[PDB]
Design a protein around this ligand. Structure first.
Ligand SMILES: [Cl-]
Ligand SMILES: [Cl-]
Ligand SMILES: [Cl-]
Length: 164
């Protein structure tokens, strides 16, 4: 298991534009196109992203290219963020993947707002961090995913991703 396999489990793979859990136009492996309610706006973003006229459909190769770019951008983002970077640097490789997963799902700003959880993670208070992380809109709106990510942060194992 690794970050790519982990996010592939959490995000799925769809080759036509769809709406994510928040109602937003998305394609591939959780690649958010736009928060606009205009399908035409989403299609324009997709064409720009892929570099051709797609008409809302991409190949598996194209979806994986976007995915690679998106994972790379999440990591670079963490490393450029004054609040996230120290947390990331403090963690082992398995828990670092938890952090990338959260950033991939909700963005840097949103994760950086988990101030109290981030402090508990940096202190390596794993059970307490896990309890605090669940007191969140994130957990209530995507509880199965949040439970897997939280278990990863709590155990520093991939146990939550191995029946899948
Ligand atoms: Cl892009
Ligand atoms: Cl995403
Ligand atoms: Cl979920």
């Amino acid at each position: 298991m690794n970050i790519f396999e982990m996010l592939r489990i959490d995000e799925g793979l769809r080759l036509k534009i769809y709406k994510d859990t928040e109602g937003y136009y998305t394609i591939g492996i959780g690649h958010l196109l736009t928060k606009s309610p205009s399908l035409n706006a989403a299609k324009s973003e997709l064409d720009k992203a892929i570099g051709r006229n797609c008409n809302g459909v991409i190949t598996k190769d194209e979806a994986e290219k976007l995915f690679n770019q998106d994972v790379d951008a999440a990591v670079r983002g963490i490393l450029r963020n004054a609040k996230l970077k120290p947390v990331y640097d403090s963690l082992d490789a398995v828990r670092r993947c938890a952090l990338i997963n959260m950033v991939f799902q909700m963005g840097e700003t949103g994760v950086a707002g988990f101030t109290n959880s981030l402090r508990m993670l940096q202190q390596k208070r794993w059970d307490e961090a896990a309890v605090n992380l669940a007191k969140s809109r994130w957990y209530n709106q995507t509880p199965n995913r949040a439970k897997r990510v939280i278990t990863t942060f709590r155990t520093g194992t991939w146990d939550a991703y191995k029946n899948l």
